[PDB]
Design a protein around this ligand. Structure first.
Ligand SMILES: [Zn+2]
Ligand SMILES: [Zn+2]
Lengths: 81, 100, 96, 125, 24, 208, 129, 87, 216
RNA sequence: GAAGAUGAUCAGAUACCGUCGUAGUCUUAACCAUAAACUAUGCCGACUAGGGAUCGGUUGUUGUUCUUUUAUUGACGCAAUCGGCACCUUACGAGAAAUCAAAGUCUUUGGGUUCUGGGGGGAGUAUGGUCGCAAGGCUGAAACUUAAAGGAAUUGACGGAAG
């Protein structure tokens, strides 16, 4: 390529490119509302959560930390914010 | 000058490799440098299968094979013609010779 | 970065580096060490008067085959004894 | 051995490339014909020259010979290789009446302004 | 000679000089 | 810009899609990526035939710029393009280069088949490198039929086609000949059906 | 580590114009870079350049149109007197009729032509031709 | 180049590549000159009217001469929606 | 009795092509030297260097003698010929043939004010062949050709009378010295100057406007 | 298995080959500070060309195999990435060339910085200093002598090298 549109790259290659190597860095991580199976209580949980987050109402661990994204326990449903 | 880019061995991202003794002369050669050949031969020559089978007390007995991994230094292999000198361009070809 | 400092405040490092490295140059070393003054038979001069101690003819080097005719001269200014050639045809006799 | 040299090979084949019609699949007439066309200093050389000439003609009769052109070979090849089967062998007649393209390529048809009947084939190999 | 042996030859000679200086 | 009749007709969309011109090599180089439409899950790559057809008109328009048809040279080392180029040479008046290409045909002026064409058309750059290489010695533009693994150096117009196909190669030469003759006016217009059938230009085995 | 944000930017321009690319991305940005680029447009050596804000040092996208030969910096930014400019231009510029020696003075970043017009002097900052 | 009196003392004003705008040398034997015809509304090639481009021998070697024409033919209308600015 | 075998040769045999700048304007390759004999009759050749190179055989040396020849018109066209042959005369004669085939145009430029005709180079140019790098710097109207005698003679035949030359490497190797000097002088039409920045339309090749006159 | 002794071979072998064999090889406390300690390529930083593999992590998706009957299994597969050890092609570019994605962005000579060299010897020697139990390490000349020594490649010649 000799002529390329650097200022408006196609979003297709933005989704595959590294977060620090994009035109402007942006986190791929997000926040979730986790409904535990025991009860319904909005608890905001980071996607890449390092801590075994438990619900405030119920002493139930929502997520177990992993190297990358934290894996929520079975019966836990999340909704992205 | 530099005859080979790999310097006649296979050490990259590495400091030291424990040496091996030549099968022919027990000379210490680095393991990644040694000429290594896998050898899976029959115990008996193909002519000796007719007379072994008839003398067998077992019906349809499979002859076990002779497994070996041979190690050579550069001098051991060349003299025994395990490897041969190649032209300056054909030295780069590292795909195995087509024989089997 | 060419291996030598480029900072605007690196004039001392550059001046020192060259000063040390001039000692590798043979002409510069002989001037400052004063070898010609100390060890050269002429003492660093151009010409030198001396006294002929005898006359000697020296074999030429290879591949040539001859005998070069010189003299052995003792110097007045510094007492050294050297060999001096006589470049011409047939004035070995004129020097005694 | 009886391998012909280049001076008898190239001299002979020039004769075909210039006098193809009047030559014949018989040596003796060719032997006499090459005696009048080319100046040959030795009769052994002419018998060598004429011998390869007829043998080349025997090869020209049984197929197309390599390296010889005499202004009638290729012209005869021009009007022979016009063969065309009545069915275009590319038309949508061998099939049931529509293309057999892949399911992925079906989107390509829809992307362009083309509404072509298609039997979707899902290989996924 | 061989460079390695010339280095070894000088070491034997160098040790001779050290021993001689030890007498005085 | 261009008359709207030059767009891809549904009939050609049938013919081009029939000969699997849209199948491109599994390995695609960085230069031929814009001609790729999507990937097939097996590993096969899809040629953007909409772009492919548009390259046919562009290259054919370059041929019409050449005054003498004898100055347009077509070459092919593959047997699949052996048959096509000959009647392409015959129909258009172009100069065919049948079989092996003798080195020095363009650079050495004492050779027997010493040509100086104003344009060279190549069936496959990878199998016809010698003609492409010599073109870069005597200032000759090159139009090459390139797959997705075809090298792209010293080629000006890349017509994406399946060079490893029986019927794909012959179809392209048919399409080029049809468009080249249309522009000069031999074919009266763009709606009439041509005397030359797609079966012609298709390589025939010695069996028959 | 990164010691001269200007030198890194001009290097990417040279490696892009010898190759024939018509655009180049500069990271990071600085006012010295932006003002050095403006002198290029006044003499036409580049097209528009686009500064991207990322709440950081920034990024710059430049449009190259091939009428540039070589642009570089002179390290360090030597002190240049008015009488010194004649020596500097001879050894850096290909001819006396074109080419520019960029100086930074208290009057702003400018080339040696308008530097001689207003008769002020500063540091040498780079060259362009 | 022109002298004091104003006459164009420059002999052999060279040409420039249509892709990189570099000067095409006299011995640039890899350089080409692509000529694309003009087509009237009837679909017939116009005699003696051509759209011409100059290619440096540089761009042909790097393989970018194919992309250069596609953009150049896109801007001049000779092609439609085949070359993408956004990559 | 000269029968051209190339399209441009048939064109230059007739009055179709009259100025060598037309050949240069389209980078048309030259293969037969009779072309510029008609176009540039004022050509001056001189032998720069004659060398004998030996090839060792089973019996002894097989000596061939090599000549380097410079050709120029003193008005901006210059070429360099290097050819090896068994005899000196044939080496010189064949080098003169191939020296003509490589004649290239140079750009004379102005140092300082553009009064009079151009006399120097428009910019500094350098050419490298082997270890020899030869740099040409424009000089004022007073200085002659400030160069070594070998490089000086080349610059004379190109019409340059005001130039500085600085050489690095083993300049005693004449062949690399002349090729590097030849390479430098050909870069005059390779440096994009502001006066050449003005874009011009592309005239069609004379091989196109005269396709019929050069068909065969 | 240095040393040593021994049996061969040889004109001679206190060498190569064979048989023993002492220090050493191993380990614990300390010294030593040198290697073709090599990638013969200092470190940090940015840019320049394509491609396929591979290790670790991460992110999304299976006619796969499997826990277990399936999921929250695992392996496999397909895509992206960051990091690495590298490999293949080309040479825009460099180089005396071999060759080099760095040995490129170097007469169009300047990103920062440390170290080293100035023809071959004499010589890493002498002397002084310093460290070490020593063996030695580090620093380190001069007299005198010499027109060459050397690098890469080519042709030939030769080889107790292959085909
Ligand atoms: Zn809860
Ligand atoms: Zn060994």
């Amino acid at each position: 390529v000799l002529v390329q549109d650097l200022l408006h790259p196609s979003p297709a290659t933005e989704a595959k490119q590294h977060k620090l190597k994009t035109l402007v860095q942006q986190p791929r991580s997000f926040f979730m509302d986790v409904k535990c199976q025991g009860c319904l209580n909005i608890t905001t949980v980071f996607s890449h959560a390092q801590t075994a987050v438990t619900c405030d109402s119920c002493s139930t661990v929502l997520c177990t930390p992993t190297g990358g994204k934290a894996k929520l326990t079975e019966g836990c449903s999340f909704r992205r914010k | 000058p530099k005859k080979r880019a790999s310097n006649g061995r296979n050490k990259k991202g590495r400091g030291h490799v424990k040496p091996v003794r030549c099968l022919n002369c027990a000379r210490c050669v680095p393991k990644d440098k040694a000429i290594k050949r896998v050898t899976i031969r029959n115990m008996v020559e193909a002519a000796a299968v007719r007379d072994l089978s008839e003398a067998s007390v077992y019906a349809e007995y499979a002859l076990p094979k002779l497994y070996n991994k041979l190690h050579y230094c550069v001098s051991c292999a060349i003299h025994a013609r395990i490897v041969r000198v190649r032209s300056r361009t054909d030295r780069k070809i590292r795909t195995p010779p087509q024989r089997k | 970065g060419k291996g030598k400092p480029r900072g605007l405040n690196s004039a001392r490092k550059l001046r020192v580096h060259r000063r040390n490295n001039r000692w590798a140059d043979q002409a510069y070393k002989a001037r400052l060490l004063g070898t010609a003054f100390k060890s050269s038979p002429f003492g660093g001069s151009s010409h030198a008067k001396g006294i002929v101690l005898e006359k000697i003819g020296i074999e030429s080097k290879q591949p040539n085959s001859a005998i070069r005719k010189c003299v052995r001269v003792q110097l007045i200014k510094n007492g050294k004894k050297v060999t001096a050639f006589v470049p011409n045809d047939g004035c070995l006799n004129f020097v005694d | 051995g009886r391998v012909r040299t280049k001076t008898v090979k190239r001299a002979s084949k020039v004769l075909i490339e210039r006098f193809y019609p009047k030559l014949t699949l018989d040596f003796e007439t060719n032997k006499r014909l090459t005696s009048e066309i080319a100046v040959i200093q030795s009769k052994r050389l002419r018998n060598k020259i004429a011998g390869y000439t007829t043998h080349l003609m025997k090869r020209i009769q049984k197929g197309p010979v390599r390296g010889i052109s005499f202004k009638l070979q290729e012209e005869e090849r021009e009007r022979k290789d016009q063969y065309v089967p009545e069915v275009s062998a590319l038309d949508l007649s061998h099939t049931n009446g529509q293309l057999e393209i892949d399911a992925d390529t079906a989107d390509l048809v829809k992307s362009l302004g083309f509404k072509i009947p298609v039997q979707t084939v899902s290989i996924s190999a | 000679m061989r460079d390695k042996w010339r280095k070894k030859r000088v070491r034997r000679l160098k040790r001779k000089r050290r021993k001689v200086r030890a007498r005085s | 810009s261009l008359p709207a009749s030059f767009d891809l007709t549904p009939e050609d969309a049938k013919l081009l899609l029939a000969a699997n011109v849209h199948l491109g090599a599994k390995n695609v180089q960085v230069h031929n990526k814009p001609y790729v439409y999507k990937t097939r899950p097996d590993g096969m790559n899809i040629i953007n035939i909409g772009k492919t057809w548009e390259k046919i008109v562009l290259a054919a328009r370059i041929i019409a710029a050449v005054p003498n048809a004898s100055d347009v040279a077509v070459c092919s080392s593959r047997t699949f393009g052996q048959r096509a180029v000959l009647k392409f040479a015959a129909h258009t008046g172009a100069t065919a280069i049948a079989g092996r290409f003798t080195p020095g045909n363009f650079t050495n002026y004492i050779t027997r088949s010493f040509k100086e064409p104003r344009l060279v058309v190549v069936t496959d750059p990878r199998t016809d490198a010698q003609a492409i290489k010599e073109s870069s010695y005597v200032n000759i533009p090159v139009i090459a039929l390139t797959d997705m693994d075809s090298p792209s150096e010293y080629v000006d117009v890349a017509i994406p086609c399946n060079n490893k196909g029986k019927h794909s190669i012959g179809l392209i030469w048919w399409l080029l000949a049809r468009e080249v003759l249309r522009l000069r006016g031999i074919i009266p217009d763009r709606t009439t059906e041509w005397s030359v059938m797609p079966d012609l230009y298709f390589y025939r085995d010695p069996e028959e | 580590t990164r010691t001269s944000v200007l030198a890194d930017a001009l290097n990417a321009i040279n490696n892009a114009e010898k190759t024939g690319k018509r655009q180049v991305l500069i990271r990071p940005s600085s006012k010295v870079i932006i003002k050095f680029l403006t002198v290029m447009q006044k003499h036409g050596y580049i097209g528009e350049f686009e500064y991207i804000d990322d709440h950081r040092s920034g990024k710059i996208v430049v449009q190259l149109n091939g009428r540039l030969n070589k642009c570089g910096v002179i390290q360090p930014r030597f002190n240049v007197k008015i009488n010194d400019i004649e020596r500097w231009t001879d050894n850096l510029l290909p001819a006396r009729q074109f080419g520019y020696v960029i100086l930074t003075t208290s009057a702003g970043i400018m080339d040696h032509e308008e530097a001689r017009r207003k008769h002020v002097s500063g540091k040498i900052l780079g060259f362009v031709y | 180049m022109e002298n004091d009196k104003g006459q164009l003392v420059e002999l052999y004003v060279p040409r420039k590549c249509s892709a990189t705008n570099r000067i095409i040398k006299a011995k640039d034997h890899a350089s080409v000159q692509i000529s694309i015809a003009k087509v009237d509304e009837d679909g017939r090639a116009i005699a003696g009217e051509n759209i011409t481009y100059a290619l440096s021998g540089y761009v042909r070697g790097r393989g970018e001469a194919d992309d250069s024409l596609n953009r150049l033919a896109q801007q001049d209308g000779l092609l439609k929606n085949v070359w993408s600015y956004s990559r | 009795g000269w029968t051209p075998v190339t399209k441009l040769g048939r064109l230059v045999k007739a009055g179709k092509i009259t100025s060598v700048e037309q050949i240069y304007l389209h980078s048309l390759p030259v293969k037969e030297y009779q072309i510029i004999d008609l176009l540039l009759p004022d050509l001056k050749d001189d032998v720069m260097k004659i060398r004998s190179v030996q090839k060792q055989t089973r019996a002894g040396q097989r000596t061939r003698m090599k000549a380097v020849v410079v050709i120029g018109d003193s008005n901006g066209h210059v070429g360099l010929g290097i050819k090896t042959a068994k005899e000196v005369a044939s080496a010189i004669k064949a080098a003169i043939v191939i020296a003509k085939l490589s004649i290239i145009p140079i750009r004379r430029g102005y140092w300082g004010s553009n009064l009079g005709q151009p006399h120097s180079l428009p910019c500094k140019v350098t050419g490298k062949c082997g270890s020899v790098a030869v740099r040409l710097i424009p000089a004022p109207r007073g200085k002659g050709i400030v160069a070594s005698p070998v490089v000086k003679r080349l610059m004379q035949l190109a019409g340059v009378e005001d130039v500085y030359t600085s050489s690095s490497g083993s300049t005693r190797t004449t062949e690399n010295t002349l090729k590097a000097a030849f390479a430098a002088i050909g870069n005059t039409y390779s440096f994009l100057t502001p006066n050449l920045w003005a874009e011009t339309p592309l005239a069609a090749s004379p091989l196109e406007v005269y396709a019929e006159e050069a068909a065969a």
